[PDB]
Design a protein around this nucleic acid. Sequence first.
RNA 1: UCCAAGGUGAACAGCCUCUGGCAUGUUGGAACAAUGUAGGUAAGGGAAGUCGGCAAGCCGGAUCCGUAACUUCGGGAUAA
RNA 2: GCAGCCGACUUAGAACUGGUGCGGACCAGGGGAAUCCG
RNA 3: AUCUAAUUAGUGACGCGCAUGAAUGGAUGAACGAGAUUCCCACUGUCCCUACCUACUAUCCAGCGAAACCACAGCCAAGG
RNA 4: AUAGCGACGUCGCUUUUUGAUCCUUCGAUGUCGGCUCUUCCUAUCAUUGUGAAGCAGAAUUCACCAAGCGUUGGAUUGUUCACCCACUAAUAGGGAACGUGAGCUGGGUUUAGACCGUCGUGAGACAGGUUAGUUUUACCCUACUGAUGAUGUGUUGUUGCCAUGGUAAUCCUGCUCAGUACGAGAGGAACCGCAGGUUCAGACAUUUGGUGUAUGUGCUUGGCUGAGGAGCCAAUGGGGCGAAGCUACCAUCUGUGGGAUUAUGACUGAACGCCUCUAAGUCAGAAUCCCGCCCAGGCGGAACGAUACGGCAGCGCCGA
RNA 5: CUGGGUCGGGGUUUCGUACGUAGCAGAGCAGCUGCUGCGAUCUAUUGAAAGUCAGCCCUCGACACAAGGGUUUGU
Lengths: 63, 394, 131
Amino acid sequence: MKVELCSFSGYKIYPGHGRRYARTDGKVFQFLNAKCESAFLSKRNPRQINWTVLYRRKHKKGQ
Amino acid sequence: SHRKFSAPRHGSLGFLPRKRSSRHRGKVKSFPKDDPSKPVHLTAFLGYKAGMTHIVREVDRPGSKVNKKEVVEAVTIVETPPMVVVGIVGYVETPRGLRTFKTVFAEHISDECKRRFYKNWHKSKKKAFTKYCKKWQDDAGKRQLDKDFSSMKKYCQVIRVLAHTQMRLLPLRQKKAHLMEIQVNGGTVAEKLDWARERLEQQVPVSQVFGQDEMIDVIGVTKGKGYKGVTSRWHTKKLPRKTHRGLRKVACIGAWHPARVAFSVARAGQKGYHHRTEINKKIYKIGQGYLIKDGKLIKNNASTDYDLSDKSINPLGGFVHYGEVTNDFVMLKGCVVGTKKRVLTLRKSLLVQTKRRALEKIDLKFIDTTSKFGHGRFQTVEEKKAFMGPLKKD
Amino acid sequence: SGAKFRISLGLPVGAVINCADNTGAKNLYIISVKGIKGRLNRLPAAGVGDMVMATVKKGKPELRKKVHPAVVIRQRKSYRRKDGVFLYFEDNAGVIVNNKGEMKGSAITGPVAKECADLWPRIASNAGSIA
RNA sequence: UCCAAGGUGAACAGCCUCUGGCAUGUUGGAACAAUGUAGGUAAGGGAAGUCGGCAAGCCGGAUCCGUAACUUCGGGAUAA
RNA sequence: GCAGCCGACUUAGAACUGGUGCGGACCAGGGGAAUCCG
RNA sequence: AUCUAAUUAGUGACGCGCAUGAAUGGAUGAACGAGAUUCCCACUGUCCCUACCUACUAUCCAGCGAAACCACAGCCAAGG
RNA sequence: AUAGCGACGUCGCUUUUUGAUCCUUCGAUGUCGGCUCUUCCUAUCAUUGUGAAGCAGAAUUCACCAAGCGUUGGAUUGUUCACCCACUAAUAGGGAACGUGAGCUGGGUUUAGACCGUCGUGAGACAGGUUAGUUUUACCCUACUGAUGAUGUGUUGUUGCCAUGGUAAUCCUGCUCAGUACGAGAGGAACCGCAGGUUCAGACAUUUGGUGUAUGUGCUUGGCUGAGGAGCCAAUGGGGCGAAGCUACCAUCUGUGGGAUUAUGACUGAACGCCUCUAAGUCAGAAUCCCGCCCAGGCGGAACGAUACGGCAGCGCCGA
RNA sequence: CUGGGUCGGGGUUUCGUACGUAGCAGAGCAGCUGCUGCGAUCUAUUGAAAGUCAGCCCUCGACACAAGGGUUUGU
Ligand SMILES: [Mg+2]
Ligand SMILES: [Mg+2]
Ligand SMILES: [Mg+2]
Ligand SMILES: [Mg+2]
Ligand SMILES: [Mg+2]
Ligand SMILES: [Mg+2]
Ligand SMILES: [Mg+2]
Ligand SMILES: [Mg+2]
Ligand SMILES: [Mg+2]
Ligand SMILES: [Mg+2]
Ligand SMILES: [Mg+2]
Ligand SMILES: [Mg+2]
Ligand SMILES: [Mg+2]
Ligand SMILES: [Mg+2]
Ligand SMILES: [Mg+2]
Ligand SMILES: [Mg+2]
Ligand SMILES: [Mg+2]
Ligand SMILES: [Mg+2]
Ligand SMILES: [Mg+2]
Ligand SMILES: [Mg+2]
Ligand SMILES: [Mg+2]
Ligand SMILES: [Mg+2]
Ligand SMILES: [Mg+2]
Ligand SMILES: [Mg+2]
Ligand SMILES: [Mg+2]
Ligand SMILES: [Mg+2]
Ligand SMILES: [Mg+2]
Ligand SMILES: [Mg+2]
Ligand SMILES: [Mg+2]
Ligand SMILES: [Mg+2]
Ligand SMILES: [Mg+2]
Ligand SMILES: [Mg+2]
Ligand SMILES: [Mg+2]
Ligand SMILES: [Mg+2]
Ligand SMILES: [Mg+2]
Ligand SMILES: [Mg+2]
Ligand SMILES: [Mg+2]
Ligand SMILES: [Mg+2]
């Protein structure tokens, strides 16, 4: 297996789940589920979505 | 006039009486052919459907791309607590068929097995087999049934062990255990019978009935769908939108002069809850149930030699609509018939198989245990807590 | 040595797709799918890596009003790899080849699916990116 | 045929409310099968369906730009 | 030409701000090229 | 000839016109048309190829309750 | 002359063409096509097994057993027919009241409104063209699909047998064989393996996708409860995301073995001293047939369990 | 001394960070001589709040309930 990270949410992707996406200019992206996929397609910036690992890291929450 | 354009007919007439099954437990219509050369062994088992999940496994088949690659496959979990052998029944061939000759029952029968003999256990006085059981502790009964054993050995050609499941260990509402006759295939009738006579009132685990990476058959009852129209019962073509008296129908029933509706014409009616036997399902893993080993319990029955975790086969929050499985289970490739917590009959293969798919060895490297009650995200609670960190609830 | 696995097919007859080469054609009107027998009322459909017949509805004048073999290299319908990943691209696109297999053009713009690549070796040589 | 409130809004449009009125339009209860009648939503394709884009769907208000052929010189025109 | 006191809805411009959402419900023209006839 | 991959369709020409033709009006033509046709863009469950959801039915029950139709009636094959 | 054809003749079969007739129906059998769906025929296009070529291979002809299984997607036309484009293995032909309108549609024929051409003095006519033109009823009987139940075994229950019915799988590609056999060359096979796919069938929901009134959780328009908070109304207010459940070649899983034999090729072997597959006897033999696997389970049976109080009582077996 | 049922508690999961309070965070504006008010929004408490079987999983926490009722059947 190659356990790997979601492009938008930043969670952990397991072999059976998720969805792959290939843009016309390369840049293969990976999504945990339709939630993250729809956010990315609607071009939501992960920095302002609260439940995202990027948002938590940027706001220094946890640790 | 002929049809302008041909098309294969919808549905199959091989399953023609599309009626609700008269039975709820799958019936073994044909047991594997007997041969005295092989040693004695059972030929069938009873399990319960729990759910489905992934497996990641390495593929070994020269020629294809998946060779030396790893793929994910859907598997179905069947909980199979060990059966209890509570009788033996003999059969003799006659020119009119295969007639039953004599049944002999064990001295001790569990009340969970005696539930099957009553339509209302609550109001009953539970008097079943009370007078029959007295035949074992007196010399009159002992010499009554020993010559019966001798007569069965002399005149019987088929021996089937009457064994019942053990629903006390299942997380189900039902306490009335199922029971069935599992034919004994082995040597001659004498040893075939004096091998069951000590298995009487004893345990039979599935690990000694089936083996790994073996092709078996599953007999069960489909999920019921109730009264369904023709377009969903037979998957006929849907009529155009301009149709006046409905469009989910079949336009022409039949010609004129046959003067009757033929049995081959699709009609509305009952869909689902049919009896079905699906062959060639491959065992992937015969799991081991929970067991207490020196105080603590061993729970890692879903831990492979490539994963080395401590996760059980149960997903997070247990199997949806079934519960959690704590007994030895059987993992089958692909989907199987029936609904959740439905009883299934496992049957040994009727055919001799010499094929790459049949003889392929199986070596799993990952069993998915994420939650099925939604989009699961974490394999186990420990890793979920490690990723999340402390919460407000503590 | 290994034939392609079945993948979902989301390009029936009548679909116009991008032409990702330098032949000058900008459209590909799927006309029929090679190797399809079909049944009653069932439209022939093509997926990644399948040879089709196509016409150019927009492009260089000499490429129009004519029937060209073509190969589909990208599709937007999600298809499942045997390893268990569902993959789908941004657009439906193909290239123009002849019956033997080599491309009429010389270069391909954008990624090329692995199923197309390992099945048509000549296209994989010109493919800038893979999967 | 006469009388005609408040808000939104161009509006006596549609929607909500006050004064006044009414008890769901000649019956109720329990289920939520098929087939209907009336509404919706659908991956990828986009008329390949059909005699025929029938039906449904797209557009839609207002402000600022821009607006062709043709013309009976007025229009076309809310062109696009 | 100024000072004071009252005032009715408009129009334009700017900053800030929201997960690009803003005629958010309701109301509310699909478009173009041609032929026949009137 | 053009339109399409493919056109008994459409448009533009050709005219020997079975049987066109000048107030039994000929030709054209802006604007208009719940008029009749063809093509293109956009859009879509028309279709590939179906699925799911909602409301009222249908369903069962309490009460209440007709009508069309009816020689006698109602399982088939062949024969005459 | 007879691989393949076949003149001049001559004998037949079929009722999927048209005729001929007028037997039934005029107190009405709804009159073209298309859509949908089932079954049947073989005069076999492909596939299985064969025999013959002017069959070297490849390709292609002719013939036999044979209808098990397939026989497509579109432009033009109301079409049936026809033609073309493309795929395919093949795009064979037909019947069932020219199958099928209380199944649809109504484009065409075939009412009443109109227009034109020809004909007529005229009203009007035209298997000439054009445009618009209400498609009713099942709750009865049967058939069919499913659902209770009845029938005997003393009453009930559990486990079972199978008489009978139904029946299902199909075709292709790639690799290897092999650039080999064959052939001067160009070209160019086959079996056995291996990997897949088409059509069909039976399931199923881990995963992907669809639905979504858990009316679950945010957002938001107009109004309303004095305001905040909390909410509500707009026949589901609208719009994101969405559990469960249903559900898609739009996801995933599975799809089988024998027997007697047909065509044909043979063995031994007479009739007919030799010869002969046939006369007696024997062999191989297939998408055919039958059965198995699979679905249902008979006014059809089997084995086994328990068999009606403690105030009454009902029962079972025995007392030749 | 066992059983289910209701409620509660955990598990899972959906959405996305609640009310209140605090902030020298806030385009700015008004009043009082730096202070006080209006102010969409932002930050912290806050992966918070809410829902979660009705056909999800476990409980051994609380509560009451459960030795019933009716009609039949004989070799
Ligand atoms: Mg046919
Ligand atoms: Mg209608
Ligand atoms: Mg789930
Ligand atoms: Mg069709
Ligand atoms: Mg009402
Ligand atoms: Mg009322
Ligand atoms: Mg009234
Ligand atoms: Mg009414
Ligand atoms: Mg769609
Ligand atoms: Mg879409
Ligand atoms: Mg068509
Ligand atoms: Mg319309
Ligand atoms: Mg215009
Ligand atoms: Mg003209
Ligand atoms: Mg007019
Ligand atoms: Mg057309
Ligand atoms: Mg013309
Ligand atoms: Mg004249
Ligand atoms: Mg004149
Ligand atoms: Mg005239
Ligand atoms: Mg009633
Ligand atoms: Mg009739
Ligand atoms: Mg009649
Ligand atoms: Mg024949
Ligand atoms: Mg009829
Ligand atoms: Mg008409
Ligand atoms: Mg008329
Ligand atoms: Mg009724
Ligand atoms: Mg049979
Ligand atoms: Mg799902
Ligand atoms: Mg979803
Ligand atoms: Mg879902
Ligand atoms: Mg508020
Ligand atoms: Mg109203
Ligand atoms: Mg959604
Ligand atoms: Mg044989
Ligand atoms: Mg012979
Ligand atoms: Mg033989």
